[PDB]
């Protein structure tokens, strides 16, 4: 049951993994493995809760991300209790903390999507956009910090597979994509949006998850390039395309 | 210096010079209230702290005056009517106390305390009525106390008693008297626009006016959100479309009175639309506000909304 | 003192006007100022769906009587006040009676001076943490709703009032926790940065000190 649930959480079938981990909490002897299995159950439940994103619905997006965050750092609460002096759960804790930070940054960015229409611009005759310019500046800084932290997790692993390293690189590219999507069409479309045409030749993606991630990356980059200077930097299309790029990134488990 | 060295010397010397006990003072002072004279000067100085700027002086004055005569509204019952009849001589309940407590309520912020004060005025002569209407219009000049006390969604007997008492004292003044410091009539109309108590004096103050500079600056908003229909008719019978354009963006107006103001702006546009359309400068916002007030409640204005929409250049893209 | 209900906060945060119309009248009264700001001013979004949402949000704020005072508060020219606060800042290098005895720009000026005084006392001290930095007009209970509304207006118009600095300043007010809660309820995206600013100062419980 544990190995089947492990494969389920490997391939993204997280409701199945959640049920199998619920079936396993009474089978362990040590409380350490109980905390580990409970944390796995909560992570699978949170990733299952992330599957409620249908399309374009930012309110339901906020609801699903909030529920997933609640379950997911309940899971990290139960995961750091499973950390041992011998074989600590260092990579698991860092990966889950980075996923928490990425989901929280996604929720904050959707809150800024909503804070475009809410909280109207100040009494000012970039500039004359209100607090939202500084909000996307802080969001870009947070996503770039997340990219650097995914990079240092990559550099600190050294024992992973090619597949796990590719997964960490995919998460880093996800938050790098969000930071670039902020920069190229909110902060400075004139300075940004160079000839960033990725030479998509032999897409040698080893997993279906990797194929979905690069398809999402290509779609979002094409949308950003197609909406580079078509609108003023305070735009409803800019927030919509970025804020739906969030949904496209989170739709794949 | 003259400050630092002085402070150091004052801290070092600690000379107090000629520097429980409440019961002794209260039972050696309650006696002179019912037996003696000139002890009321101490009460006058005690009531002078109610006129002080700081909150704490008024708080301690209220706390000290609560027990010397002997659930804040219940405190009002225990302190206004139970300890009313004759503790002092008749001099100490007259204008000597009344003026002091009148100057107390101008900066007084507690609403039920103000309620107790105005109840005390209603309980108990021409100059007395003059000062009573002066302090009445002065406390009506601030609208936050009527906003907090009188809520149409929170019917309380205290507010009804307050408004009935004010109607009673204004009945007494209008019976006394039948350019004239015309703010008092504005005050009395803006508290009779509250509505009747949940008594008969309300209809008296209602029908003394409306004979079937002097008023229009800010009145129509508050005497249109009133639910009484006579004031609605008095509003609609004496206006021209400039104030119609003034109150078209005012809010809080209920459904019935927005229907009457909609039909009156409709017939105003039917009379002469050119001046009212030239006076306003916003077009999309004007159409937006009349549309949302059209679909918010009763419609009332189907044709002339389309007329004013077609007069302005309409939206070219869906 | 009531607080903003959670469901009202998700309705404000998700800007879902359908469930925002199902709010109670006191909750709507607490949440007025940001709705007035997004309804009266230019939308700055300029989409048909948000135009329809603004049309639906203009309905429930029309029936409220207290929104006219807020509309008058928007009418004050804030451009002159930003140099006035700047000149008052360079000089630094009953309040309720004046509140109901002065007009809207003077009410803005006095509340703004109070807020900058509390901010300057916060920034001057390292870890003093005065329980009552200034017992003032925020302490009366009768006029605290208009005080909180005008504080929200004086916060979300200029950049001279930082959100985390206002959050740290309202801690020393004797009733400023409710003010901070409704102010965060007015600016929904700032909840994370207010929480981050408030956690980042003060290490232990200090034996449950002020």
UniProtKB/Swiss-Prot annotation, chain A:
Keywords: Chromosome, Cytoplasm, DNA damage, Nucleus, Phosphoprotein. Disulfide bonds: none annotated. The keyword Phosphoprotein applies. Its main location: nucleus. One of its GO terms (cellular component) is chromosome. One of its GO terms (biological process) is cellular response to ionizing radiation. It is found in: Nucleus; Chromosome; Cytoplasm. Component of the Integrator complex, composed of core subunits INTS1, INTS2, INTS3, INTS4, INTS5, INTS6, INTS7, INTS8, INTS9/RC74, INTS10, INTS11/CPSF3L, INTS12, INTS13, INTS14 and INTS15. The core complex associates with protein phosphatase 2A subunits PPP2CA and PPP2R1A, to form the Integrator-PP2A (INTAC) complex. Interacts with NABP2. Belongs to the Integrator subunit 7 family. Component of the integrator complex, a multiprotein complex that terminates RNA polymerase II (Pol II) transcription in the promoter-proximal region of genes. This is Integrator complex subunit 7. It comes from Homo sapiens (Human). The chain holds residues 526 to 788 of 962 of the full protein.
Curated annotation (Swiss-Prot), chain B:
The modification Phosphoserine is found at residue 318. Signal peptide: none annotated. It is found in: Nucleus; Nucleus membrane. The chain crosses the membrane at residues 179-197. Component of the integrator complex, a multiprotein complex that terminates RNA polymerase II (Pol II) transcription in the promoter-proximal region of genes. It is linked to Neurodevelopmental disorder with cataracts, poor growth, and dysmorphic facies: An autosomal recessive neurodevelopmental disorder characterized by severe global developmental delay with motor impairment, cognitive delays, absent or severely limited speech, dysmorphic features, hypotonia and cataracts. Belongs to the Integrator subunit 1 family. Component of the Integrator complex, composed of core subunits INTS1, INTS2, INTS3, INTS4, INTS5, INTS6, INTS7, INTS8, INTS9/RC74, INTS10, INTS11/CPSF3L, INTS12, INTS13, INTS14 and INTS15. The core complex associates with protein phosphatase 2A subunits PPP2CA and PPP2R1A, to form the Integrator-PP2A (INTAC) complex. Interacts with ESRRB, ESRRB is not a core component of the Integrator complex and this association is a bridge for the interaction with the multiprotein complex Integrator; attracts the transcriptional machinery. This is Integrator complex subunit 1. It comes from Homo sapiens (Human). The gene is INTS1.
From Swiss-Prot, chain C:
It is found in: Nucleus; Nucleus membrane; Cytoplasm. Disulfide bonds: none annotated. It comes from the Eukaryota. Belongs to the Integrator subunit 2 family. Component of the Integrator complex, composed of core subunits INTS1, INTS2, INTS3, INTS4, INTS5, INTS6, INTS7, INTS8, INTS9/RC74, INTS10, INTS11/CPSF3L, INTS12, INTS13, INTS14 and INTS15. The core complex associates with protein phosphatase 2A subunits PPP2CA and PPP2R1A, to form the Integrator-PP2A (INTAC) complex. Component of the integrator complex, a multiprotein complex that terminates RNA polymerase II (Pol II) transcription in the promoter-proximal region of genes. This is Integrator complex subunit 2. It comes from Homo sapiens. The lineage of its organism: Eukaryota, Metazoa, Chordata, Craniata, Vertebrata. The gene is INTS2. The chain holds residues 15 to 241 of 1204 of the full protein.
């Amino acid at each position: 049951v544990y190995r089947i649930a492990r494969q389920a959480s490997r391939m993204g079938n997280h409701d199945m993994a959640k049920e199998l981990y619920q079936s396993l909490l009474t089978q362990v002897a040590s409380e350490h493995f109980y905390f580990w299995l409970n944390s796995l159950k909560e992570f699978s439940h949170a990733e299952q809760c992330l599957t409620g994103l249908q399309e374009e619905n930012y309110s339901s997006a906020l609801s699903c991300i909030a529920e997933s965050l609640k379950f997911y750092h309940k899971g990290i609460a139960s995961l750091t209790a499973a950390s041992t002096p011998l074989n600590p759960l260092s990579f698991q804790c860092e990966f889950v903390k980075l996923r928490i930070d990425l989901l929280q940054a996604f929720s904050q960015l959707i809150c800024t999507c909503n804070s475009l229409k809410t909280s109207p611009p100040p009494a000012i005759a970039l500039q004359r956009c209100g607090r939202i310019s500084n909000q996307m500046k802080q969001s870009m800084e947070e996503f770039r910090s997340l990219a650097s932290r995914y990079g240092d997790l990559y550099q600190a692993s050294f024992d992973a597979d090619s597949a796990t390293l590719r997964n960490v690189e995919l998460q880093q590219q996800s938050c790098l994509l969000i930071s670039h999507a902020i920069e190229a069409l909110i902060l400075d479309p004139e300075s940004a949006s160079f000839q960033e045409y990725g030479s998509t030749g032999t897409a040698h993606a080893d997993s279906e998850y990797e194929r979905r991630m690069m398809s999402v990356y290509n779609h979002v980059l094409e949308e950003v390039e197609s909406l580079n200077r078509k609108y003023t930097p305070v735009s409803y299309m800019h927030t919509a395309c970025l804020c739906n790029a969030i949904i496209a990134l989170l739709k794949v488990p | 210096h003259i400050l630092d060295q002085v402070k150091s010397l004052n801290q070092s010397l600690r000379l107090g010079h000629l520097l429980q006990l409440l019961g002794r003072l209260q039972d050696l002072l309650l006696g002179p209230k019912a037996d003696e004279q000139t002890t009321c000067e101490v009460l006058d100085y005690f009531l002078r702290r109610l006129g002080s700027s700081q909150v704490a002086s008024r708080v301690l004055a209220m706390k000290g005056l609560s027990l010397v005569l002997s659930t804040d509204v219940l405190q009002g019952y225990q302190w206004l009517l139970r300890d009313l009849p004759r503790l002092p001589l008749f001099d100490s309940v007259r204008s000597t106390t009344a003026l002091a407590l009148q100057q107390a309520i101008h900066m007084e912020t507690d609403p039920q305390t103000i309620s107790a004060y105005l109840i005390y005025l209603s309980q108990h002569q021409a100059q007395h009525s003059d000062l009573a209407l002066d302090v009445a219009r002065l406390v009506v000049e601030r609208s936050t106390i009527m906003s907090h006390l009188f809520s149409k969604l929170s019917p309380s007997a205290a507010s009804d008693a307050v408004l009935s008492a004010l109607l009673s004292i204004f009945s007494r003044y209008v019976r006394r008297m039948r350019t004239m410091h015309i703010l008092v009539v504005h005050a009395m109309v803006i508290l009779l626009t509250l509505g009747p108590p949940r008594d008969s004096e309300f209809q008296a103050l209602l029908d003394i006016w409306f004979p079937e500079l002097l008023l229009p600056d800010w009145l129509k908003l508050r005497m249109i959100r009133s639910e009484v229909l006579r004031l609605v008719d008095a509003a609609l019978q004496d206006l021209e479309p400039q104030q119609l354009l003034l109150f078209v963006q005012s809010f809080g107006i209920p459904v019935s009175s927005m229907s009457k103001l909609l039909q009156f702006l409709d017939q105003a546009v039917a009379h002469d639309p050119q001046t009212l359309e030239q006076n306003i400068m916003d077009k999309n916002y004007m159409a937006h506000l009349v549309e949302v007030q059209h679909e918010r409640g009763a419609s009332g204005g189907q044709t002339f909304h389309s007329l004013l929409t077609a007069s302005l250049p309409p939206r070219r893209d869906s | 003192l009531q607080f903003v209900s959670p469901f009202a906060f998700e309705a404000m945060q998700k800007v879902d006007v359908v469930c925002l119309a199902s709010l109670s009248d006191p909750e709507l009264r607490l949440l007025l100022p940001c709705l007035v700001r997004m309804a009266l001013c230019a939308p700055a979004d300029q989409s048909q769906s948000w135009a329809q949402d603004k049309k639906l949000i203009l309905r429930l704020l029309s029936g409220v009587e207290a929104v006219n005072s807020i509309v008058a508060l928007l009418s004050v020219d804030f451009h002159a006040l930003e140099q006035d606060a700047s000149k008052e800042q360079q000089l630094r290098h009953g309040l309720t009676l004046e509140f109901e005895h002065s007009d809207s720009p003077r009410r803005l000026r006095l509340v703004l001076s109070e807020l900058l005084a509390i901010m300057n006392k916060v920034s001057e001290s390292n870890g003093e943490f005065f329980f009552k930095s200034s017992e003032l007009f925020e302490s009366p209970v009768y006029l605290e709703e208009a005080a909180d509304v005008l504080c929200i207006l004086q916060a979300e118009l200029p950049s001279l009032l930082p959100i985390v600095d206002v959050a740290e300043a309202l801690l020393h007010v004797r009733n400023g926790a409710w003010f901070l809660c409704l102010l965060v309820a007015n600016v929904p995206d700032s909840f994370n940065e207010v929480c981050r600013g408030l956690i980042k100062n003060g290490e232990r419980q200090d034996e449950e000190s002020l």
